[PDB]
Design an enzyme around this catalytic site. Structure first.
Site, PDB file in Angstrom:
ATOM      1  N   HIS A   1       0.807  -1.217   0.000  1.00  0.00           N
ATOM      2  CA  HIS A   1       0.000   0.000   0.000  1.00  0.00           C
ATOM      3  C   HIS A   1       0.845   1.273   0.000  1.00  0.00           C
ATOM      4  O   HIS A   1       0.357   2.324  -0.427  1.00  0.00           O
ATOM      5  CB  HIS A   1      -0.934  -0.003   1.222  1.00  0.00           C
ATOM      6  CG  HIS A   1      -1.518   1.340   1.544  1.00  0.00           C
ATOM      7  ND1 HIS A   1      -2.647   1.831   0.923  1.00  0.00           N
ATOM      8  CD2 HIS A   1      -1.117   2.304   2.407  1.00  0.00           C
ATOM      9  CE1 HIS A   1      -2.921   3.033   1.397  1.00  0.00           C
ATOM     10  NE2 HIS A   1      -2.006   3.346   2.297  1.00  0.00           N
TER      11      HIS A   1
ATOM     12  N   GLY B 165      -1.567   5.529  10.503  1.00  0.00           N
ATOM     13  CA  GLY B 165      -0.126   5.415  10.571  1.00  0.00           C
ATOM     14  C   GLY B 165       0.381   4.100  11.119  1.00  0.00           C
ATOM     15  O   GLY B 165       1.600   3.896  11.164  1.00  0.00           O
TER      16      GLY B 165
ATOM     17  N   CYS C 192      -0.185   1.073   9.802  1.00  0.00           N
ATOM     18  CA  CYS C 192       0.121   0.085   8.776  1.00  0.00           C
ATOM     19  C   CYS C 192       1.564  -0.389   8.892  1.00  0.00           C
ATOM     20  O   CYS C 192       2.482   0.407   9.096  1.00  0.00           O
ATOM     21  CB  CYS C 192      -0.102   0.673   7.384  1.00  0.00           C
ATOM     22  SG  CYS C 192      -1.801   0.780   6.884  1.00  0.00           S
TER      23      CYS C 192
END
Lengths: 300, 300
Positions: free
Chosen positions: B41, B141, B143
């Site tokens: 991502h 944040g 991830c």
């Protein structure tokens, strides 16, 4: 989102844990710069109503085996401060973090690094109860495990574990060796005193719930501080002060729910129960999260 | 004694967390030897139904900023494996632990090190639910935060965090980039499927309770495995297998309570509730402790 009981990352404390052995007694110590801190209990056996002053005078440096992993640390001085022993060693810990020794208040939380034989085994959060005990998880060999908070890479040590009380709860000292609560490091019939629920923390957790989408317990009512505290006394909850209301300000602002509005919800929860529903996955009102703990996880 | 939800000490994983930035997207990565692992991502923005093969072909090494604390790590190669990006860097992590990449089963637990901008913020335990979600605590944040277990100083990584589902639960991949459950790393209406309660874990926790002195729910009855599983189906509990009974053997032996004897207690708890009482401080039956988790804390 989500709300979880969360410990601080334990790495900075892991690098400080050592094993301290004296005779046939082994427990954990905390190695900061060239000093190892541990419970003075390490210098006696089971036969020692002890006089620790006499017990320490009869010891020498060579009676103390300190092991940091594989490396043995040579003890070059020893002294006692209240219920903690300080062992000066010939090597400064190269992994010493920035740190402080702070004593915490009942109602505040900290992370515990459970340790055995100088080896960390797990990490979890505890609140200091109003009766100065903590509800921990400690097996034989956990003496000297420490509790801490971390703020901007500074570790504030607040707890060293000493013993377990008859109800299965736990008692210990600050890092100056002063016990939390009316407990001693000898064998007595000592027991935990009556406890109470930490009201400000329960309200903080209700705010956490609203931030995370649980709203069923809210209502249109408000209450006065005095009338709430009448209900609090009835259910063995601590009184709510104006400073508590002030501390909850940021959470009240984020949710738009006045503190005394939330107090009306708590009053109804105390008087009626939950009627089969849950709040943040609990069927009981939770009081071990401080306002700071909530704000830490509910930034969004 | 005492029983607490407990994470593994996080130090070995803390030394592996870095920050990965691509364009205006920043998230966390895992630095092991000379490779950084992170969610793919990181290479798209909000406008990117994405084709990640095309998106990566259009990138160069210099498009990836990797920061380990202060030190910037030079990216010298990039590739994609399923939903994870692998960034080869010019420095092996000197703090790489012994490690494995393992995929875990529903019903198993692991520690999550929540991280933001490459900086660890907290640690907590999660169970992989039967529907392949976890009930975590992740803000924007997070991830690339990872889940793990530790066995004899070997870190078995099992989870990398990718996204949050509409119910506030969380989905991610193993460290090979393969999602747990029927989820994807793009924007869809995907939602958690129906979940069930992990029966073997509830029984393990009842054994933990007995070991810790909670006995009120016990009774003189036993039940057959087939008749228990009829009740389990009625209350959305997973069926109990003979392998589950075998796994609970050590706890059954320690307490002297046959597994099918404890099943009779669980049947009565399901049919009658608790009648205002609690088990290990809970008013609900807890299913996020494995038999291993219990044995870990209930050695005594």
């Amino acid at each position: 989102s989500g709300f979880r009981k969360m410990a601080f990352p334990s790495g900075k404390v892991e690098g400080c844990m050592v094993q301290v052995t004296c005779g046939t007694t082994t427990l954990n110590g905390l190695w900061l710069d060239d000093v190892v801190y541990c419970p003075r209990h390490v210098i006696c056996t089971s036969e020692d109503n002890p006089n620790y002053e006499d017990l320490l005078i009869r010891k020498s440096n060579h009676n103390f085996l300190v092991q940091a992993g594989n490396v043995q640390l040579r003890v070059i001085g020893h002294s006692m401060q209240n219920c903690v022993l300080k062992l000066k060693v010939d090597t400064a810990n190269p992994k010493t973090p920035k740190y402080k020794f702070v004593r915490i208040q009942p109602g505040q939380t900290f992370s515990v690094l459970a340790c055995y034989n100088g080896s960390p085994s797990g990490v979890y959060q505890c609140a200091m109860r109003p009766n100065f005990t903590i509800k921990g998880s400690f097996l034989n060999g956990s003496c000297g495990s420490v509790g801490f908070n971390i703020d901007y890479d500074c570790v504030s040590f607040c707890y060293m574990h000493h013993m377990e009380l008859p109800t299965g709860v736990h008692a210990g000292t600050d890092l100056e060796g002063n016990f939390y609560g009316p407990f001693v490091d000898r064998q007595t019939a000592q027991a935990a005193g009556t406890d109470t629920t930490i009201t400000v923390n329960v309200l903080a957790w209700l705010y956490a719930a609203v931030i995370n989408g649980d709203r069923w317990f809210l209502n249109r009512f408000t209450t006065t501080l005095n009338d709430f505290n009448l209900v609090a006394m009835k259910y063995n909850y601590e009184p709510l002060t104006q400073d508590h209301v002030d501390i909850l300000g940021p959470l009240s602002a984020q949710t738009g729910i006045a503190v005394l509005d939330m107090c009306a919800s708590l009053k109804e929860l105390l008087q009626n129960g939950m009627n089969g529903r849950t709040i943040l996955g609990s069927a009981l009102l939770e009081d071990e999260f401080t306002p700071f703990d909530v704000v830490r996880q509910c930034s969004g």
